[PDB]
Amino acid sequence: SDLNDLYRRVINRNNRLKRLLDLGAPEIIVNNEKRMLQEAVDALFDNG
Amino acid sequence: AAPVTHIWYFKGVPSRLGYLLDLAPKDLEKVIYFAAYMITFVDEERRTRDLPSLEAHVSVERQQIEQRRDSDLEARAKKLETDLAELEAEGAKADVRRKVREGAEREMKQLRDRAQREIDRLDEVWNRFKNLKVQDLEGDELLYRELRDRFGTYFDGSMGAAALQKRLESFDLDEEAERLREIIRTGKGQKK
Amino acid sequence: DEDDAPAQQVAAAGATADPVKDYLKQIGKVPLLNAEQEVELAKRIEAGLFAEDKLANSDKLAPKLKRELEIIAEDGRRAKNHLLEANLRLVVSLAKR
Amino acid sequence: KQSVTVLLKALGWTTEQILEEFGEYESMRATLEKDHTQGQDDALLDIYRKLRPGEPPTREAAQTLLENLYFNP
Numbered sequence: 098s099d100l101n102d103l104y105r106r107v108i109n110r111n112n113r114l115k116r117l118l119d120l121g122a123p124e125i126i127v128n129n130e131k132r133m134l135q136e137a138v139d140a141l142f143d144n145g
Numbered sequence: 146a147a148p149v150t151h152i153w154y155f156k157g158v159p160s161r162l163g164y165l166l167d168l169a170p171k172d173l174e175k176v177i178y179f180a181a182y183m184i185t186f187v188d189e190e191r192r193t194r195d196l197p198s199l200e201a202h203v204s205v206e207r208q209q210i211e212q213r214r215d216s217d218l219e220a221r222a223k224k225l226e227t228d229l230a231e232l233e234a235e236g237a238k239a240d241v242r243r244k245v246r247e248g249a250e251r252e253m254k255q256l257r258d259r260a261q262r263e264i265d266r267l268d269e270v271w272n273r274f275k276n277l278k279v280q281d282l283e284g285d286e287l288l289y290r291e292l293r294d295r296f297g298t299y300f301d302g303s304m305g306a307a308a309l310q311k312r313l314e315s316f317d318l319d320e321e322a323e324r325l326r327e328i329i330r331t332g333k334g335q336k337k
Numbered sequence: 338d339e340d341d342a343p344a345q346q347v348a349a350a351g352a353t354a355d356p357v358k359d360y361l362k363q364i365g366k367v368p369l370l371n372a373e374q375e376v377e378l379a380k381r382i383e384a385g386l387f388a389e390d391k392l393a394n395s396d397k398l399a400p401k402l403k404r405e406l407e408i409i410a411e412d413g414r415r416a417k418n419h420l421l422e423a424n425l426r427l428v429v430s431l432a433k434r
Numbered sequence: 435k436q437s438v439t440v441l442l443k444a445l446g447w448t449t450e451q452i453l454e455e456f457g458e459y460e461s462m463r464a465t466l467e468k469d470h471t472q473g474q475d476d477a478l479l480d481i482y483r484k485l486r487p488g489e490p491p492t493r494e495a496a497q498t499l500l501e502n503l504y505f506n507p
Contacts (some may be wrong), residue, residue, distance in 0.1 A: 106308045106375065111146055111243045112372070113205050114147060121414065122249045122422060123418045125363055125364075125422060125425070126421070129179075129319075129360055130304060132178060132179045134147060134149065135150070135177065135178065135306060136150045136356060137150045139152040139156075142151065142152045151397070171352075174352070178359075179359075180359065284350045285349075340476070340488075341479070341491060344479065344480075344483055344490075345489060345490040345491070348488060348489060348490060348491075349488075351487045353487075358488070362488050364488075
């Protein structure tokens, strides 16, 4: 079912955000991950 | 790791988002999706108490541009006098002095135009300090960096859903209701 | 003659609702690096690296000098982020494939 | 929304030659005088801003887009 795919994305993007925050990373790169994480959660609750 | 905002409660009809924070939906799209800053908090009391000190720092800072402007203009004045005089003593062609002076004043205009950019940008950063009320969106990222670098511990600024979380923390919803009731009690037009 | 100048500033502060468009915009104008420039950046990485290494050691160092080492350590951090932001365009090229 | 005169001006046709072909139809003459923008270079950069906002105008980049959008094979 499609929920697995959408749950997979938010888990993936959240996991990478933890990696980016852990090492020293710029503002541009971390902002893009936070932006993509926010978009992923949006798709899960109401796609479109 | 980083908080996010429910797609339902914002990004919908305005009977559900409600303008609970007095922000337009275009404003919200800019802040929570990392395209414009918000001033989540201002130390408005600090700013009043130390005001002459920050006033003293900007004023001496203002002096330096005037000293620098005086010298560049002095060099500009000397440059125009020197090239026209040297050409006219040689007399290689009919109008050597006029063409280079035309070229020389074009250079002065570029320097003068640059002088306008530096003073006005400095003027612009100062006036945004004086309008540092909370929930103020700030579109220009470069301008925010000039505010942040020149002075901290007075305005707290952020971006995204974390900024919104801070704003709701600092919300005083009972007082907002009272002021909204007063507008309903005495108001006219679409404002009501 | 200042016709082009107001158009460029208002075009910098646009919406760009698409995520992909915003990231490409985000990269913006950052200086692409020629040979001598990027080698000089690498100098300040190891300069800053040796600075924080001595600071990481437990033996006492002078306080004013410690701030100078912190300046080198901060500059090493700045030089790292400068190098990454310049080369952000390269990684997007290989991502196409 | 944009006007037709800015479209024609984006093309090589200048205001002088435009008016001889279209001087008998008042809609384009009315549009012409109400159109404040003038000049081939000016019109080209303006439409670039409207079509693809977010970037500074570049003379070569503006010109190739109009070729790319329609005239490119």
